[PDB]
Write a structure and sequence with these properties.
Phosphorylase Kinase, domain 1, Transferase(Phosphotransferase), domain 1, globular, binds the ligand COc1cc(Nc2nn3c(NCC(C)(C)N)cc(C4CC4)nc3c2C(N)=O)cc(OC)c1, identical protein binding
């Protein structure tokens, strides 16, 4: 729809950027207020860094993925400077929050609770026929009630045949990304499952880098021998075996997010 009929377009004055949370090559992230009283996050595009259509495509993907377990789209401003406005999460990214005094005091039980919540959200994405493509703790946000939501949907894609294929020069984070997407550019929901397995380690280690002590080429080589990540410190053997399911050789042998979600709630109500 044209901006004048767009239910998502808002006039810029309704917004007040208060605190800049982050800044980078492509824009800034602010805490702000909508119409005075409502805390919101505001993503703003650095003019010239990328096309506005490229930027705005994030807000169009989010429009299609509405669910309590995913970060909710709020509005857009489509005249420069371009804004994407969303649900505000007070405890920031999962990987940062796990390092704070609060985060450190969390039981394994609450940790498993959060794992289940993230899996619950990926269960919704999966059934909507989407993939995320960048699932990892840095892309999980935390609420003021220690709730978890999936975020950063820029790489998300609609699957009509469960397989999106990236450019031949496209690069992705090697430690978080399934072999087949690394090797062939082929992304399925089962690639997200492999990444979720990696995510489970960050959770149990409070935001530590996966495959401790290893370079990217070492990870590739070890994985190709049939090894997987060494058991993290303070990681229940049950969870580790759920990680191993996530990291199976054949994409199709890895579990659905619905299964992972059901298992982790069992783990959690058992602790
Ligand atoms: C990073 O530092 C902080 C960020 C935030 N908030 C946020 N960062 N953040 C992103 N940042 C990028 C990410 C961290 C998710 N990779 C990406 C997205 C996508 C657009 C929904 N949303 C957000 C929010 C949000 N919706 O609240 C809050 C903090 O409070 C202490 C600290």
């Amino acid at each position: 729809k044209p901006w004048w009929e767009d239910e998502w377009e808002v006039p810029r004055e309704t917004l007040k950027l208060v605190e800049r949370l982050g800044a980078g090559q492509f824009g800034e992230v602010w805490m702000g207020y909508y119409n005075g009283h409502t805390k919101v996050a505001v993503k703003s595009l650095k003019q010239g860094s990328m096309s506005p259509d490229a930027f705005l495509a994030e807000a169009n993907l989010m429009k299609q993925l509405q669910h309590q377990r995913l970060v909710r789209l709020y509005a857009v401003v489509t005249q420069e400077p371009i804004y994407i406005i969303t649900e505000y999460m007070e405890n920031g990214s999962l990987v940062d929050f796990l390092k704070t005094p609060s985060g450190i005091k969390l039981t394994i039980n609450k940790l498993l609770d959060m794992a289940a919540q993230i899996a619950e959200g990926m269960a919704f994405i999966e059934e909507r026929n989407y993939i995320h493509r960048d699932l990892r703790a840095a892309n999980i946000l935390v609420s003021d009630t220690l709730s978890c939501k999936i975020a950063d949907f820029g790489l998300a894609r609609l699957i009509e045949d469960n397989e999106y294929t990236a450019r031949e020069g496209a690069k992705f984070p090697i430690k978080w990304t399934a072999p087949e997407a690394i090797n062939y550019g082929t992304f399925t929901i089962k690639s997200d499952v492999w990444s979720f397995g990696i995510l489970l380690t960050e959770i149990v280690t409070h935001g530590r880098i996966p495959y401790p002590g290893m370079t990217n080429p070492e990870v590739i080589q070890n994985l190709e021998r049939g090894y997987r990540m060494v058991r993290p410190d303070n990681c229940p053997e049950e969870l580790y075996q759920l990680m191993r399911l996530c990291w199976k050789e054949r994409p199709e042998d890895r579990p659905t997010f619905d299964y992972l979600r059901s298992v982790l709630e069992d783990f959690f109500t058992a602790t």
